[PDB]
Design a protein that fits this description.
Chains: A mainly alpha (157), B mainly alpha (227), C mainly alpha (197), D mainly alpha (125)
Number of domains of chain D: 1
Helix content of chain D: over 70%
CATH class of chain A: Mainly Alpha
CATH class of chain D: Mainly Alpha
Protein name (chain D): V-type proton ATPase subunit D
Radius of gyration of chain A: 18 Å
Family (chain B): Belongs to the ATPase alpha/beta chains family.
Structural class of chain A: mainly alpha
Strand content of chain D: under 5%
Protein name (chain B): V-type proton ATPase subunit B
Subcellular location (chain B): Vacuole membrane
Number of helices of chain A: 9
Organism (chain B): Saccharomyces cerevisiae (strain ATCC 204508 / S288c) (Baker's yeast)
Number of strands of chain D: 0
Order of helices and strands of chain D: HHH
Structural class of chain D: mainly alpha
Oligomer: part of a larger assembly
Largest interface: B-C, 24 and 30 residues
């Protein structure tokens, strides 16, 4: 918080400000990994997920909670990008892809539960229709997660 | 053959036989058969050539009561890049399994181009397993072969509609194929890798794929291997 | 010993060529497809091979790379371009990726700016080893730079329309008055590669 | 006409037609799935556009999305036509080209084997 406030602060000297931003970046470098948010970032970038309690643990979710939305919820947009790409295209659920879309469903569910303002984007991202379209799936677990996210969207309307 | 036989039945020692350019020996045997002025068969080849090969490849095997074993691995170049040649057809049903060569991979500037698809061995079941090589041998072998095949199919598919239509298992098989081609397949001229190093490299290359990405692997093996 | 078989129709099933194949240490094939296409002298990509390539590389260890090890790279590019064109012929230019288009352009370039040789022309009559190695180095440079730029977030169209001189210069890189103007041409080529950005 | 080279070219063309048939089949499947999803989306867009039909400003942000959905619909129709052409090509690569190539290869093989048999008979004589 001190580094955040310092970053939000102002400085007359150039070296002071440069060292401030550098120290903030240096702190944020190892701050993201504790509780590593980069672990989920690797799964997101590679578009391949696995079994980890990243979205299961409230603490781990709370650690990356502040990093969920930076500019127009870019991280959230990239998070929904995989599911959307698995919606408009692909959408053949077997083995990996199904559990990945389900884990992404639960993660986005916890995310929406944490961030109330994350709904307005989901409507403009076409995720509102895709989430409802996921009500009927091949797996009962996938349908359960989709129904959970449906009730989550029904929580705040 | 007699030299290998003398070091087996008598000297009682492990022996290995290697023959190069069996096609040249086939043309030589053709000239030898023509020396008797006998009427040649199809495509100018002796009809007894099957027995001639049967008098060659039958010099390999294990003897009961003898510790020393003799193994033979002949080599023949297919004429005009065709497997339809009489020689290949002769050694095909006789010998168990065959090791082919891909001209594309050889023209790709890589290490030895043995196509995993065509490569097979009938006695391969007895050459692996616990006490022989490893329990992770056959399973990872079939899994790697499946990865290369499905990777090839996905390579053909991606060359059609593009890489935007790439699916999960499709992209995984693509990366696995590219990796195996640029890592697993490529060894070297003087390079010799141990079976343990081969299995380790296989598991490391298969680590790119998820745990559910391999349907050819058993639960116990996967639990006793992956770490 | 330089021997040339005369197979009828350009078939590799010729008994003369069949017998000469299991003897000669080097075989240069002539593709009937490229020959009837009024293209400069035909050489099959996958069929052409040399058993002395290892020894020739050992002798090239003194003369160094470019293009001792880059011949295998160009072979990889040409083979991959062949496997890509094999599908493309049954597919077309409609659905393809960026790397695929770059590979196709690399194929057309390797065909036109390298394999093509005019014996009738005084300038194209012959090319030096260092000259051909320089052309291959330039082609591999443009190719690697294209692959790098494709990973930099740049499209194919803008990159293709960016430099139109570099291509025409890459096609003209076959001497044409060797060997004195070699190093300077290499410097200009590197200057263009640095001018690409 | 009956040459080994011709047999090789015919066989190569046959294999290429087979691989092309498989590729066209998979492409037809993907196009079918895509056209199906686009069809469901077309129905959803039909109900959405039918929701409000028959005031103030900002109507420019309304009919635009409907125009996009209409573009998706037309693209879906074109995808259906293309899928039909692909299915026709697959049908032409099934009982037409494959059978013709197989029959031609069989006849050529018979002719070559018979010619070789005649030559071998003359040599034996």
């Amino acid at each position: 918080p001190t580094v955040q406030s310092l970053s939000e602060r102002k400085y007359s000297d150039e070296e002071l400000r440069q060292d401030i931003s550098n120290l903030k970046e240096i702190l944020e470098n190892e701050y993201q990994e504790l509780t590593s948010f980069d672990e989920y970032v690797a799964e997101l970038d590679s578009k391949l997920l696995c079994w980890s309690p990243p979205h299961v643990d409230n603490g781990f979710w709370s650690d990356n909670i502040d990093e969920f939305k930076k500019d127009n919820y870019k991280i959230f947009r990239q998070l929904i990008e995989l599911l959307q790409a698995k919606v408009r295209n692909g959408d053949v659920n077997a083995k990996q892809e199904k559990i990945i879309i389900q884990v992404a469903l639960n993660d986005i569910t916890h995310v929406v539960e944490l961030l109330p303002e994350s709904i307005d984007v989901l409507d403009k991202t076409g995720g509102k229709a895709d989430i409802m379209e996921l009500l009927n799936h091949s797996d009962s677990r996938v349908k359960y997660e989709a129904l959970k996210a449906t009730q989550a969207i029904i929580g705040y309307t | 053959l007699t030299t290998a036989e003398y070091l087996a039945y008598q000297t009682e020692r492990h022996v290995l036989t290697i023959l190069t350019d069996m096609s040249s020996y086939a043309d030589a045997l053709r000239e030898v058969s023509a020396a008797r002025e006998e009427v040649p068969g199809r495509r100018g080849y002796p009809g007894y050539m099957y027995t001639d090969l049967s008098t060659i490849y039958e010099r390999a095997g294990r003897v009961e009561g003898r510790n020393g074993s003799i193994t033979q691995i002949p080599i023949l170049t297919m004429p005009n890049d065709d497997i339809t040649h009489p020689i290949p057809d002769l050694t095909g049903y006789i010998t168990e399994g065959q090791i082919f060569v891909d001209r594309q991979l050889h023209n790709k500037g890589i290490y030895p181009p043995i196509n995993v698809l065509p490569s097979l061995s009938r006695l391969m079941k007895s050459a692996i397993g616990e006490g022989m090589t490893r329990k992770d041998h056959g399973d990872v072998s079939n899994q790697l072969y499946a990865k290369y095949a499905i990777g090839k199919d996905a390579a053909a598919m991606k060359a059609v509609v593009g890489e935007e239509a790439l699916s999960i298992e499709d992209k995984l098989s693509l990366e696995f194929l590219e990796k195996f081609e640029k890592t697993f397949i490529t060894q070297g001229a003087y390079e010799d890798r141990t079976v343990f190093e081969s299995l380790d490299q296989a598991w490391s290359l298969l680590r790119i794929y998820p745990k559910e990405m391999l349907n050819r692997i058993s639960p116990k093996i996967l639990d006793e291997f992956y770490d | 010993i330089v021997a040339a078989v005369s197979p009828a129709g350009g078939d590799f099933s010729d008994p003369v060529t069949t017998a000469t194949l299991g003897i000669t240490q080097v075989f240069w094939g002539l593709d009937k497809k490229l020959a009837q296409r009024k293209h400069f002298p035909s050489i099959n990509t996958s069929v052409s091979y040399s058993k002395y390539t290892n020894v020739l590389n050992k002798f090239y260890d003194s003369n160094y790379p470019e293009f001792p090890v880059l011949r295998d790279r160009m072979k990889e590019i040409l083979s991959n371009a062949e496997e890509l064109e094999q599908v493309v012929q049954l597919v077309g230019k409609s659905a393809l990726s960026d790397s695929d288009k770059i590979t196709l352009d690399v194929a057309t370039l390797i065909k036109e700016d390298f394999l093509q040789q005019n014996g009738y022309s005084t300038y194209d009559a012959f090319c030096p080893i260092w000259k051909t190695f320089d052309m291959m180095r330039a082609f591999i440079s443009y190719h690697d730079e294209a692959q790098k730029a494709v990973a930099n977030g740049a499209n194919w169209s803008k990159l293709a329309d960016s430099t139109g001189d570099v291509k025409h210069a890459v096609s003209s890189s076959k001497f044409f008055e060797p060997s004195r103007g070699e190093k300077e041409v290499h410097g200009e080529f590197e200057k263009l590669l640095s001018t690409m950005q | 006409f009956p040459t080994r080279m011709t047999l090789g070219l015919m066989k190569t063309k046959l294999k290429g037609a087979n691989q092309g048939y498989s590729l066209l089949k998979r492409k037809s499947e993907a196009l079918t799935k895509r056209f199906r999803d686009i069809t469901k989306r077309i129905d959803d867009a039909k109900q959405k556009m039918g929701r409000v039909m028959q005031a103030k400003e900002i109507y420019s942000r309304a009919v635009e999305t409907l125009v996009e959905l209409a573009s998706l619909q037309t693209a879906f129709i074109i995808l259906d036509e293309v899928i039909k052409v692909t299915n026709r090509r697959v049908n032409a690569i099934e009982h037409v080209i494959i059978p013709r190539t197989e029959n031609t290869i069989a006849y050529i093989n018979s002719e070559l084997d018979e010619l070789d048999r005649e030559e071998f008979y003359r040599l034996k004589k």
